[PDB]
RNA sequence: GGAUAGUGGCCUACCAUGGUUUCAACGGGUAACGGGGAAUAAGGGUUCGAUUCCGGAGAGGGAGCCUGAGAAACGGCUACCACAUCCAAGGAAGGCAGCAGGCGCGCAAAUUACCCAAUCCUAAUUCAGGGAGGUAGUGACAAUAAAUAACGAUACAGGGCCCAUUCGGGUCUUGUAAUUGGAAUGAGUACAAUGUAAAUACCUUAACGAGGAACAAUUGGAGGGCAAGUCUGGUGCCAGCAGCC
């Protein structure tokens, strides 16, 4: 007995669990970005639900009040640095209509896809998780990185990992040693 | 080749413990885990001190590799090293020998045993012998 | 009659060996390409599991 | 709860249905009350 | 007045007859230790809190008491009640609701492991000690992240377009194919170094480790609520399924 280490859960199961429209919508915006399960979308939906409650909390009260000004600007700054808002939408009313899609357009696999050298995003997810894509002097195996609008320029392949230069195989060395006898 | 480059950042000078306390910052590229023995060797040159007078620990190769981050102590002399360095570190460096004493459960057993015999139990060892003729 | 008759009766036809279903993400790649890309022709609502229509 | 099975029972279903419900009467280890538990699948009365 | 470290019906003696209560006294119950908090989430709430912190209580059940600054202490003593030991029958020793472990009780819970290296505590006290406490083991109670495949070539299809001279040249793309070919990585495994008190595990890495039969992902469902068959074989108010109809 020392002290309770704080854990919290990031996902949330939808209220009515069989619904043609929701199932259609979720499979679509899972098939677009090449996700593994529906909890990916439930998590992004939970994160946006936390932001929206934090937004309404700061909105309902007085305007030009230090609490609204400080916490509002902190959130907007954090979101515009993620890339979920752009330069010209920093009003704390744009944030309230933020479309989980926008967060899903900023995962590492989506960025690896959209910056080329990725060939269909299911290759981009398997690339990342196979220790290939390093942001900059730093590998990332997480296909839910949330790229932060300054690593967009520096993101590339690792110094290691062929796609890179250092490592030439693990299967190529095999084929080299097998075709060495001719 | 590798050409491993070391950087001793966040230096605090400590004249109390006769120390240079710093964060060792190693680059590995094309190898990893540069052998704390070799680290002390090539850290002896940066402070022209004897390699028995420098101590490093907790290197922890970073995720993806190519880099390690340890904490490194340099002493003014080896006599000071032995005075202030804990014995476990001194045996890792091979200067002091680890006292190979009895297992803690045997030590706790025999102190609980010696709780009973009052004083030097010689006059009790002179009964256990002389009560065998009854 | 007595317990376990219709199970002790039923002619157990065994399962057929097939190629597996590719688990995880690849299964959602299949479920996407089989519903929102190459779906069976719609009359009113799509029929997900019809026999010989 | 846990219990030791006294008897095998054939309880007759209520009126719109018709079957023998393959129950088991069981004395509770916990307190000593005798209850009647259902065996929850096809040929499981032969298993208990 | 006595006693107490001290205040006090705290106790004693002598007086008065007071004091609480339908704003719930008193009595009974609690599968009630209180609180910081916890779960659920429009707002208002409801339910819970033995359990990482704070406080109170107890060390089988009552009572008593010595030693001490501090105890009505229980890994201190004494007596009685309960239960229990060894006994050579005269005696002797007991107190795990500390750690681990065994019974029992049960729907229901772990190793008779390693260490003072960290956090601190105690001492005549830098060194000694510490089942406090940490380390490993068991561990799908919960919680976080996320493998179980990706890519082209070869043969069929379809879908936007030139004129629909019947032409289709298919010049682009969305797939289908038991056809196909190279690149990828850990899951494992192991020199090593790192980690550590010592180790294990992670982190990083020599060498090895993917080809459908695999390195094989299940669990619950397909009348309705409720996503998903009016498809085959069997049973024939039986066997059964069925939270509800």
Curated annotation (Swiss-Prot), chain A:
Coiled coil: none annotated. Residues 160-182 are annotated as: Disordered. SMART domains: Ribosomal_S4, S4. It is found in: Cytoplasm; Nucleus, Nucleolus. SUPFAM superfamilies: Alpha-L RNA-binding motif. Component of the small ribosomal subunit (SSU). Mature yeast ribosomes consist of a small (40S) and a large (60S) subunit. The 40S small subunit contains 1 molecule of ribosomal RNA (18S rRNA) and 33 different proteins (encoded by 57 genes). The large 60S subunit contains 3 rRNA molecules (25S, 5.8S and 5S rRNA) and 46 different proteins (encoded by 81 genes). Interacts with snoRNA U3. uS11 interacts with MPP10. Component of the ribosomal small subunit (SSU) processome composed of at least 40 protein subunits and snoRNA U3. Component of the ribosome, a large ribonucleoprotein complex responsible for the synthesis of proteins in the cell. The small ribosomal subunit (SSU) binds messenger RNAs (mRNAs) and translates the encoded message by selecting cognate aminoacyl-transfer RNA (tRNA) molecules. The large subunit (LSU) contains the ribosomal catalytic site termed the peptidyl transferase center (PTC), which catalyzes the formation of peptide bonds, thereby polymerizing the amino acids delivered by tRNAs into a polypeptide chain. Present with 63300 molecules/cell in log phase SD medium. There are 2 genes for uS4 in yeast.
Curated annotation (Swiss-Prot), chain B:
The keyword Ribonucleoprotein applies. GO terms for cellular component: cytosol; cytosolic small ribosomal subunit; mitochondrion. It is found in: Cytoplasm. N-terminally acetylated by acetyltransferase NatA. Also partially acetylated by NatC. There is a cross-link at residue 20 (Glycyl lysine isopeptide (Lys-Gly) (interchain with G-Cter in ubiquitin)). The modification Phosphoserine is found at residues 13, 55. Residues 104-114, 123-134 have a biased composition (Basic residues). One of its GO terms (molecular function) is structural constituent of ribosome. Pfam families: Ribosomal_S24e. Residues 101-134 are annotated as: Disordered. The modification N-acetylserine is found at residue 1. Keywords: Acetylation, Cytoplasm, Isopeptide bond, Phosphoprotein, Ribonucleoprotein, Ribosomal protein, Ubl conjugation. One of its GO terms (biological process) is cytoplasmic translation. Its main location: cytoplasm. Component of the small ribosomal subunit (SSU). Mature yeast ribosomes consist of a small (40S) and a large (60S) subunit. The 40S small subunit contains 1 molecule of ribosomal RNA (18S rRNA) and 33 different proteins (encoded by 57 genes). The large 60S subunit contains 3 rRNA molecules (25S, 5.8S and 5S rRNA) and 46 different proteins (encoded by 81 genes). There are 2 genes for eS24 in yeast. Belongs to the eukaryotic ribosomal protein eS24 family. This is Small ribosomal subunit protein eS24A. It comes from Saccharomyces cerevisiae (strain ATCC 204508 / S288c).
UniProtKB/Swiss-Prot annotation, chain C:
One of its GO terms (molecular function) is structural constituent of ribosome. It comes from the Eukaryota. The modification Phosphoserine is found at residue 8. One of its GO terms (biological process) is cytoplasmic translation. Component of the small ribosomal subunit (SSU). Mature yeast ribosomes consist of a small (40S) and a large (60S) subunit. The 40S small subunit contains 1 molecule of ribosomal RNA (18S rRNA) and 33 different proteins (encoded by 57 genes). The large 60S subunit contains 3 rRNA molecules (25S, 5.8S and 5S rRNA) and 46 different proteins (encoded by 81 genes). Component of the ribosome, a large ribonucleoprotein complex responsible for the synthesis of proteins in the cell. The small ribosomal subunit (SSU) binds messenger RNAs (mRNAs) and translates the encoded message by selecting cognate aminoacyl-transfer RNA (tRNA) molecules. The large subunit (LSU) contains the ribosomal catalytic site termed the peptidyl transferase center (PTC), which catalyzes the formation of peptide bonds, thereby polymerizing the amino acids delivered by tRNAs into a polypeptide chain. This is Small ribosomal subunit protein eS30A. It comes from Saccharomyces cerevisiae (strain ATCC 204508 / S288c) (Baker's yeast). The chain holds residues 9 to 61 of 63 of the full protein.
Swiss-Prot record, chain D:
The modification 3,4-dihydroxyproline is found at residue 16. The keyword Cell inner membrane does not apply. It is found in: Cytoplasm. Keywords: Cytoplasm, Hydroxylation, Isopeptide bond, Ribonucleoprotein, Ribosomal protein, Ubl conjugation. Its main location: cytoplasm. Hydroxylation at Pro-16 affects translation termination efficiency. The stereochemistry of the 3,4-dihydroxyproline has not yet been determined. GO terms for cellular component: cytosol; cytosolic small ribosomal subunit; ribosome. GO terms for biological process: maintenance of translational fidelity; maturation of SSU-rRNA from tricistronic rRNA transcript (SSU-rRNA, 5.8S rRNA, LSU-rRNA); regulation of translational fidelity; translation. There is a cross-link at residue 8 (Glycyl lysine isopeptide (Lys-Gly) (interchain with G-Cter in ubiquitin)). One of its GO terms (molecular function) is structural constituent of ribosome. Component of the small ribosomal subunit (SSU). Mature yeast ribosomes consist of a small (40S) and a large (60S) subunit. The 40S small subunit contains 1 molecule of ribosomal RNA (18S rRNA) and 33 different proteins (encoded by 57 genes). The large 60S subunit contains 3 rRNA molecules (25S, 5.8S and 5S rRNA) and 46 different proteins (encoded by 81 genes). Belongs to the universal ribosomal protein uS12 family. Present with 10600 molecules/cell in log phase SD medium. This is Small ribosomal subunit protein uS12A. The chain holds residues 49 to 96 of 145 of the full protein.
């Amino acid at each position: 007995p020392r002290a309770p280490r704080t854990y919290s859960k990031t996902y949330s199961t939808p209220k009515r669990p069989y619904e043609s429209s929701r199932l259609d919508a979720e499979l679509k915006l899972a098939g677009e970005f090449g996700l593994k399960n529906k909890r990916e979308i439930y998590r992004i939906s939970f994160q946006l639900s936390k932001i929206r409650r934090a937004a309404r909390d700061l909105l309902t009260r007085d305007e030009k009040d230090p609490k609204r000004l400080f916490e509002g600007n902190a959130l907007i700054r954090r979101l515009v640095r993620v890339g979920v808002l752009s330069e010209d939408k920093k009003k704390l009313d744009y944030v309230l209509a933020l479309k989980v899609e926008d967060f899903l357009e900023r995962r590492l696999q989506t960025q690896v896809y959209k910056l080329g050298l990725a060939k269909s995003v299911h290759h981009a997810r398997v690339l990342i998780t196979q220790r290939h894509i390093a942001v900059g002097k730093q590998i990332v195996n997480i296909p839910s990185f949330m790229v932060r609008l300054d690593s967009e320029k520096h993101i590339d392949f690792a110094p290691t990992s062929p796609f890179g230069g250092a490592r030439p195989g693990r299967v190529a060395r095999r084929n080299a040693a097998r075709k060495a006898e001719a | 080749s590798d050409a491993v480059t070391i950087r001793t950042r966040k230096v605090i000078s400590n004249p109390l413990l006769a120390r240079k306390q710093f964060v060792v910052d190693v680059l590995h590229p094309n190898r990893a885990n540069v052998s704390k023995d070799e680290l002390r060797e090539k850290l002896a040159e940066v402070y022209k001190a004897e390699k028995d007078a420098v101590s490093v620990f907790g290197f922890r190769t970073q995720f993806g590799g190519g880099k390690s981050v340890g904490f490194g102590l340099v002493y003014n002399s080896v006599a000071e090293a032995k005075k202030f360095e804990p014995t476990y570190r001194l045996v890792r460096y091979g200067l002091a020998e680890k006292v190979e004493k009895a297992s803690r459960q045997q030590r706790k057993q025999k102190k609980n045993r010696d709780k009973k015999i009052f004083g030097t139990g010689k006059r009790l060892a002179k009964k256990v012998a002389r009560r065998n003729a009854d | 009659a007595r317990a376990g008759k219709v199970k002790s009766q039923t002619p157990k036809v065994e399962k057929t060996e097939k190629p597996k279903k590719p688990k995880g993400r690849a299964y959602k790649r299949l479920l996407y390409t089989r519903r929102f890309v190459n779906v069976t022709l719609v009359n009113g609502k799509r029929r997900m599991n019809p026999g010989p229509s | 709860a846990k219990g030791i099975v006294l008897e095998k029972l054939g309880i007759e279903s209520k009126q719109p249905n018709s079957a023998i419900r393959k129950c088991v009467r069981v004395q509770l280890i916990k307190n000593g009350k005798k209850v009647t538990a259902f065996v929850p699948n096809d040929g499981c009365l032969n298993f208990v």
